[PDB]
Design a protein around this nucleic acid. Structure first.
Lengths: 205, 170, 293, 159
RNA sequence: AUUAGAGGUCUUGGGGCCGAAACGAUCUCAACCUAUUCUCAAACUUUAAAUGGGUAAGAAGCCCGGCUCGCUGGUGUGGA
RNA sequence: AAACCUCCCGUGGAGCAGAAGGGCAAAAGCUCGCUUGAUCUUGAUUUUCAGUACGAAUACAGACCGUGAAAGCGGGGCCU
RNA sequence: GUCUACGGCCAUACCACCCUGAACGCGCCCGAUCUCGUCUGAUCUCGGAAGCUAAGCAGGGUCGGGCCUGGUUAGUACUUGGAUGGGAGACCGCCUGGGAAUACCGGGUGCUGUAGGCUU
């Protein structure tokens, strides 16, 4: 089938995205990046667990698809079918090439698009999971089971942010009281003091 | 205590007959606009070719003509006489203008003759206001501003107090 | 719905045109060809005659371009003509000739070149061009800045042009845009041009409204009736005006009186006021809300 | 191998700055250039006539000839281990007055000023520039306050 | 190039539902729009380094005075 | 849904023979009018470069013209 | 104080909406005999002066958008030079110097030359 992942592990080439020049690329194996009860508000899933990368390497689209399933499978058994929300925060955009044989050797050896891969950095979030803070030890096991589908090493970190938002869990609840944050579906909208005053009236009444 | 420069007037009245085909069928429709308005009309050719309609690129398919002054006002009085001084709320555009189509031109009172035939033309009134000449003068061109614009309803109510026309919804 | 065009992105990428272009006063395409001087001239000024006819006046200026802005060497306005006898009609063609003639003689008088370079004292309307006199200071030379005016035959900007060349300015021109160039046959008869210069074309229009309708005549000419300028004495009025211009083109500015130093405009609001109004608007919005509660 | 086109690789060099397209400001045209004027070259893409070749964009030369619309400049071009003072004819739009020489011209004035001055006074006033010297000895007052302590903050995993 | 939900309106359309029917209502499902949100670009970019490339740091320079010109010209003007 | 007419918004999202990049809004686009600077002739210079040619190009100068009210612009094609 | 004509820089000047504009001015506006040009005196050209600041324009306003300028981001990212530094590698730390960009948070909202008015 396809080569081992050792062949395409290190960020060797410049980013080679599927574009006008590189056409004919087969679709990535991962197509669904959010699953669980993704239609949930911001006030029921406070805890958020990360799988942070520690290596500047490439993660295949097949590893991303496999790790999404293995982490999905464990959460379904653990926190039911609707007690979490998984978000794969790496999209495979780099196209890898293959110089398949069948002799020509290296004459005109510019490969054809083989598959797609995601260039991850050091300290970059690979996959995130929000759930009730009760089920804390249930996500660390879901992410621990997902590391084995990935080359290199990764750290599992439980964020101090509230859910998938960019606000600390220590400051979230109050910033909703004085209405700096209005719940907007899966996320929240920050509201500054810069707009027209008529919008301020619409909130405080 | 309204301002005397805000009285809504008629800028122009645009009449076209889209025959959609060249030939004598059009040059005859040319002369109906002639002896109706009193001025030689201008032709308008097709932008591109469409097989279904039977028109080709740059083919002369229509003829139009614009009328100003009191010559415009009396033709509008003639056209609405055919429409019993009634229009619909959708006939008025949100830019302050309105229009309506007639079915035959002899309805205006002009005498038919067999050498010409009968053509249904199209009306479109462009309401105005003293000061709209700014947006098309060469030197210090400029817009008109919100207050001076003509909304849809103040165009319809103008049609009310002008010709006692009724505006039926539908 | 439909996508909004003028969004945040629209203004982030929007590049305004030049101020004089956004206002619609300068054609920078033609200005680039007018004002700039050849590089091997080195501060030799390139004078140009600016003619701008407005609704109630005619402005004739002469300027050369500098880095910090055009500099006006001298200017003549139509509202000065009442001094020289032209009471009314300060924007017609015959007035344009006077304003051009005034600008010329005023400029030469500031150069000590009024004695030399008289021009056409006996106005004819023909193709006249002043040439420099050897052994004397060279004749002044400028170019016509029509601006944005559509330059067709009989445009008033060429009336001031004819007034300038008859005053003693060496302006390159062709006798094709003058009123009198017959277009279909391609000749120029100076006589009909002499009519427009002495204001005869309007004189007959007063005579035309004599037997046709006098009430409409009173409506087209009111200050003509108020200043008692009948078509009889119009042609001699301009001839008296021209002679009064060539004999005293100097300009004496109006005396500048000190004024009470008041302010009709509204001063710009400060930040403390702008910031405090928001506190009142929000507080009043609340103290009006519990009244409903 | 690459092509030898004249405007090769000048996609950004001759492009107009952001939100600075359109008509050229006329002050560039009404700018005098005497002979021997130090001038720096900067190609503008709006005007395609008389553009300098891309190997002079950013170089600085001196004017030696002035025509109606352009000037002749003598620029130093390095060609494989030898410098060539070569002449180019570039139209005014791609030209600026170099402000590298003026700070010398300005410094000449005070030198010529402070020479005739303080000559009759006799006071010998330093003229040559001198590099930034080692700073003098001074006292630092700690009136009241005492220097606050600095200690490295402990690490905490960001991601 | 691209993930996800929100808030909109029939702006239209998809099976309908009580509608003969009706932008009237009804749950809708979609695209559409407005705010957000995840992820990128050797042949994208508003921004934008470090290293780097020119030029200048005087006597061939500055400052006065006078002549020459067929060049340039309101003007011993401009320039040389 | 698309024929033609009218109004409004419209920083170029069009167009400029072609590849792509750059450039362009009272224009370099579109539409008209008049035209043949796509002509005659010296040198200089740039590009590739050995700093040789050819090609292409840029500034001039001398003519003869075109156009425009004119400043001007034009010795082929907006530039590569 | 402010305007007109011609400008220089070309948004701190733009855009949306709202308010107020003495005097002069700029305009709208009134006409088509002549000049000139249109299918149409709408534009353009021309001749005017009854009316009006409604609009343009000018000024001001908006917890305005944009823009301009700071702070923050951050000595972070990146980076010159150096080591018989670490690490299986991928990469990382240190030494020696240089040093950013969003989000987020402030402040600002045209200066000005020549000529001529008005407020006498």
């Amino acid at each position: 089938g396809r080569r081992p992942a050792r062949c395409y592990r290190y960020c060797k080439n410049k980013p080679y995205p599927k574009s006008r020049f590189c056409r004919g690329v087969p679709d990535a194996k991962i197509r669904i990046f959010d699953l669980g009860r993704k239609k949930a508000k911001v006030d029921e899933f406070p805890l958020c667990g990360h799988m942070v990368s520690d290596e500047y390497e490439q993660l295949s689209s097949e590893a991303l698809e496999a790790a999404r399933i293995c982490a999905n499978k464990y959460m379904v058994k653990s926190c039911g079918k609707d007690g979490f929300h998984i978000r794969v925060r790496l999209h495979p955009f780099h196209v890898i090439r293959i110089n398949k044989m069948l002799q020509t050797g290296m004459r005109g050896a510019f490969g054809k698009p083989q598959g797609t891969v995601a260039r991850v950095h050091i300290g970059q979030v690979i996959m995130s999971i929000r759930t009730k803070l009760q089920n804390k030890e249930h996500v660390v096991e879901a992410l621990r089971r997902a590391k084995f589908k990935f080359p290199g090493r990764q750290k599992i970190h439980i964020s101090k942010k509230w859910g998938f938002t960019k606000f600390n869990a220590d400051e979230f609840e109050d910033m909703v009281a004085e209405k700096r944050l209005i719940p907007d579906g899966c996320g929240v909208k920050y509201i500054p003091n810069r707009g027209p005053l008529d919008k301020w009236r619409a909130l405080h009444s | 205590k309204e301002n005397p420069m805000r009285e809504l007037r008629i800028r122009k009245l645009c009449l076209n007959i889209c025959v959609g085909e060249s030939g004598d069928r059009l040059t005859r429709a040319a002369k109906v606009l002639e002896q109706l308005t009193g001025q030689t009309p201008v032709f308008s050719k097709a932008r591109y070719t469409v097989r279904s309609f039977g028109i080709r690129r740059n083919e002369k398919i229509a003829v139009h003509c614009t009328v100003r002054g009191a010559k415009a006002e009396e033709i509008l009085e003639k056209g609405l006489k055919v429409r019993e001084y009634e229009l619909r709320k959708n006939n008025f555009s949100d830019t302050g203008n309105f229009g309506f189509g007639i079915q035959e031109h002899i309805d205006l009172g002009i005498k038919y003759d067999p050498s010409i035939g009968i053509y249904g033309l199209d009306f479109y009134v462009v309401l105005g206001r003293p000061g709209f000449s700014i947006a098309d003068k060469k030197r210090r061109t400029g817009c008109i501003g919100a207050k001076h614009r003509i909304s849809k309803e103040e165009a319809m109510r103008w049609f009310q107090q002008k010709y006692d026309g009724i505006i039926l919804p539908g | 719905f439909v996508k909004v065009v003028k969004n945040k992105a629209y203004f982030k990428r929007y590049q305004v045109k030049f101020r004089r272009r956004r206002e619609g006063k300068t054609d920078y395409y033609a200005r680039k060809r007018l004002v700039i001087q050849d590089k091997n001239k080195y501060n030799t000024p390139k004078y140009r005659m600016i003619v701008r006819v407005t609704n109630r006046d005619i402005i004739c200026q002469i300027a050369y371009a500098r880095i910090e802005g055009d500099m006006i060497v001298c200017a003549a306005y139509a509202h000065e003509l009442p001094k020289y006898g032209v009471k009314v009609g300060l924007t017609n063609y015959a007035a344009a000739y006077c304003t051009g003639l005034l600008l010329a003689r005023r400029l030469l008088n500031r150069f000590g070149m009024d004695k030399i370079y008289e021009g056409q004292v006996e106005v004819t309307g023909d193709e006249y061009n002043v040439e420099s006199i050897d052994g004397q200071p060279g004749a002044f030379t400028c170019y016509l800045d029509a601006g944005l005016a559509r330059t067709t035959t009989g445009n008033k900007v060429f009336g001031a042009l004819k007034g300038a060349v008859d005053g003693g300015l060496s302006i390159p021109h062709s006798t094709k845009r003058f009123p009198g160039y017959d277009s279909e046959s391609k000749e120029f008869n100076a006589e009909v041009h002499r009519k427009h210069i002495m204001g005869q074309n309007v004189a007959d229009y007063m005579r035309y409204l004599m037997e046709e309708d006098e009430d409409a005549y009173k409506k087209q000419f009111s200050q003509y009736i108020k200043n008692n300028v009948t078509p009889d004495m119009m042609e001699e009025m301009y001839k008296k005006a021209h002679a009064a211009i060539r004999e005293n083109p100097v300009y004496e500015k109006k005396p500048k009186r000190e004024v009470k130093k008041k302010r009709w405009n509204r001063p710009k609001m400060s930040l403390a006021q702008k910031k405090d109004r928001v506190a009142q608007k929000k507080a009043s919005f609340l103290r009006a809300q519990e009244r409903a509660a | 191998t690459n092509t030898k086109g004249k405007r090769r690789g000048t996609r950004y060099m001759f492009s107009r700055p952001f939100r600075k397209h359109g008509v050229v400001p006329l002050a560039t045209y009404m700018r005098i250039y005497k002979k021997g004027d130090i001038v720096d070259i900067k190609g503008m893409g709006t005007v395609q006539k008389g553009m300098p070749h891309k190997c002079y964009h950013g170089k600085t030369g001196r004017v030696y000839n002035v025509t109606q619309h352009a000037v002749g400049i003598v620029v130093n071009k390095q060609v494989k281990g030898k410098i060539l003072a070569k002449r180019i004819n570039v139209r005014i739009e791609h030209i600026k007055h170099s402000k590298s020489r003026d700070s010398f011209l300005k410094r000449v004035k005070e030198n010529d000023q402070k020479k005739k001055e303080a000559k009759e006074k006799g006071t010998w006033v330093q003229l040559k520039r001198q590099p930034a010297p080692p700073r003098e000895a001074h006292f630092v007052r700690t009136n009241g306050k005492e220097p606050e302590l600095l200690e490295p903050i402990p690490y905490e995993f960001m991601a």
